[PDB]
Amino acid sequence: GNCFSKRR
Amino acid sequence: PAKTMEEASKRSYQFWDTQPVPKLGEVVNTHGPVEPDKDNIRQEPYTLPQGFTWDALDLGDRGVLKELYTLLNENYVEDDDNMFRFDYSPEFLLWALRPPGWLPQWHCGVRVVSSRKLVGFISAIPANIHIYDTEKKMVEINFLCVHKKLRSKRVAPVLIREITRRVHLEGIFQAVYTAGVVLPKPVGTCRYWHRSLNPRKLIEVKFSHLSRNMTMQRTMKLYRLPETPKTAGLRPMETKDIPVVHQLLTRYLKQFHLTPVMSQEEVEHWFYPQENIIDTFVVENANGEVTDFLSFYTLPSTIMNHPTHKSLKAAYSFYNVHTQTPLLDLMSDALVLAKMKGFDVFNALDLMENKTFLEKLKFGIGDGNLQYYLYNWKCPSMGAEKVGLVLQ
Ligand SMILES: CC(C)(COP(=O)(O)OP(=O)(O)OC[C@H]1O[C@@H](n2cnc3c(N)ncnc32)[C@H](O)[C@@H]1OP(=O)(O)O)[C@@H](O)C(=O)NCCC(=O)NCCS
Ligand SMILES: *C(=O)CCCCCCCCCCCCC
Ligand SMILES: [Cl-]
């Protein structure tokens, strides 16, 4: 699967 | 699991050590299969823990598709801090799971025998993959999910072994897939970057926060975009553009080391615009010729445990081909179009030539690495800018 990312 | 290579070095892979993939430690200097093609394949499904059964999901049944949506909506991938979860829509799942050549048995579900509750899933789709100087028929693995209540009970190795068997039955012995975790052994490591389109919403939900040195007023101004795109003759992709989009894509991808090889039917499927799924815009110039195109797909996320904001609307960069328009103006128009369509953030990886525009166009680096993997294929690793493959 994909991977969830957020800022930093 | 280990997201960093640091923690991965300190790990033992009871399951992955049994699989035909290079060890995390070694460096690869050869090109080819880890093990030869098997000429006899196990006929029986692998044994599941008592109380559970296999079930191939006919996604053409709206109710079965709904169960899959609900399983993923509640149990699929989350960020590091358990703040966001992918919310793939039913119609998106049809786009990603029924491309040309799809097989029903490759939508591999696990159900509770008594309740029939769908509690596990994994999928394969076929794809021709170009890796260095070899073109191989492979599968793409995606949507590996185990219900939160069934976790840590050895179910994921069974799903992996069972989809492998079903793929082997069709004569295919290599696979490509991505993950946020480090596994044996990445062919390349990409990093997500994020471009804020609705910065207020992104800060209230803590997808982002302010710089100490910037105010909310400045932060909004810094991310302000024009109301309409700048490139002449940019327009949504149409049926008449399928041959030329296929042509531009095929020639553009030759400069990278890991790429899809798409038939024209696959190009229609992956790029022909579908509302709230996939957007593609072409550049038809003053002579009537299509010279460039941009594309991004739609993948919202659930905002968990928040009383007011429930979902984050995300656009994901897909394939962007330039031959006359500069890439940086191409991606600038992508941001405007995504803003126009209601998106809160625009995501893109650091692969292909994306690094040439990420900082200039005001993306912020993310916290998640996306690892790329080949199964039963030994080849040297590659930098992100040589990776020319984007999954969903
Ligand atoms: C990922 C998921 C299916 C794994 O299930 P789990 O119950 O926690 O793990 P299990 O107890 O069944 O078995 C652990 C094995 O699975 C491996 N594994 C964990 N995540 C994996 C992944 N994305 N891909 C392949 N293998 C994975 C582990 O490396 C481990 O093998 P090892 O002993 O060689 O290290 C489950 O956590 C889940 O559904 N997470 C939410 C969605 C998700 O992350 N999907 C995968 C996207 S790449
Ligand atoms: C995202 O959901 C990826 C999860 C990947 C699990 C690894 C499985 C890879 C091997 C697949 C079978 C290969 C068939 C030749
Ligand atoms: Cl189906």
Q: Which residues are paired to B118 by β-bridges?
A: B111
Half-sphere exposure of B257 (CA within 13 A, CB side): 16
The listed CATH number (1.10.10.60, 3.50.50.60, 1.10.3720.10, 3.40.630.170) that belongs to domain B1-392? 3.40.630.170
CB contact under 8 A, A1 and B207: no
Enumerate the known binding-site residues of B. 14-16, 143-146, 152, 154-156
CB contact under 8 A, A1 and B144: yes
Atom of ligand 2 nearest to the CA of B172: 15
Best residue of B68, B77, B195 to probe chain A, by most A CBs closer than 10 Å: B77
Atom of ligand 2 nearest to the CA of B163: 12
**How many angstroms separate the CA atoms of B222 and B209, rounded?**
14
Give, using CA atoms, the residue closest to atom 14 of ligand 2. B164
Find, in chain A, the residue whose alpha carbon is nearest to that of B207. A6
Find, in chain A, the residue whose alpha carbon is nearest to that of B85. A4
Residues of chain B neighbouring A6 (CB-CB closer than 8 A):
79-80, 83-84, 194, 207-208, 366-368
**B198-201 contacts: CB < 8 A, separation 24 or more?**
B198/B343, B198/B344, B198/B345, B199/B223, B201/B309, B201/B312, B201/B344
Q: B301 by DSSP, 3-state: which? A: strand
Write down the residue that tokens 């590091």 correspond to: B80
CA distance readout (Å), B309 to B194, B203, B306, B323, B326: 19, 11, 6, 41, 37
Spatial CB neighbours of B213, under 8 Å, sequence gap ≥ 6: none
Under 8 Å between Cβ of B200 and B252: no
| Interface check B73 vs A, CB under 8 A | no
Domain boundaries, chain B: 1-392
Under 8 Å between Cβ of B77 and A4: yes
E strand intervals along chain B: 52-56, 84-86, 107-112, 118-131, 134-146, 175-179, 188-196, 234-236, 258-261, 278-284, 290-298, 301-303, 311-312, 314-317, 345-349, 364-375
**Total Cβ atoms within 10 A of residue B275:** 9
Cβ–ligand 2 contact at A6 (below 6 Å): no
Pocket of ligand 1 (CB under 6 A): A 1; B 1, 13-16, 75-77, 144-146, 151-157, 179, 181, 183
CB contact under 8 A, A6 and B76: no
Mutate which of B118, B145, B150, B299 for ligand 1? The one with the most ligand atoms within 8 Å of its CB, which is B145
- Identify the DSSP state of B358: H
Cα B50 to the center of its chain, rounded Å = 33
Method underlying the structure: X-ray
CA distance readout (Å), B79 to A7, B17, B24, B120, B310: 11, 27, 24, 20, 15
Of B388, B11, B368, nearest to B193 by C-alpha is B368
Q: B266 by DSSP, 3-state: which? A: helix
Indicate the resolution in Å: 2.3
**Total Cβ atoms within 10 A of residue B192:** 25
Measured between CB atoms, which of A1, A2, A6 is closest to B367? A6
Measured between CB atoms, which of A1, A4, A7 is closest to B364? A7
Find, in chain A, the residue whose alpha carbon is nearest to that of B3. A3
Pick left, alpha or beta for residue B122 (phi over 0 → left; psi -120 to 50 → alpha; otherwise beta). beta
Amino acid at B40: N
* DSSP-assigned states of every residue in B211-262: -TTS-HHHHHHHT---SS--STTEEE--GGGHHHHHHHHHHHHTTSSEEEE-
- B60 CA distance to ligand 3 middle (Å): 6
Q: What are phi and psi of B132, to 5 degrees?
A: 55, -120
Query: Within the 1-8 window of chain A, which residues sit less than 8 Å (CB to CB) from chain B?
Result: 1-8
- Identify the DSSP state of B41: -
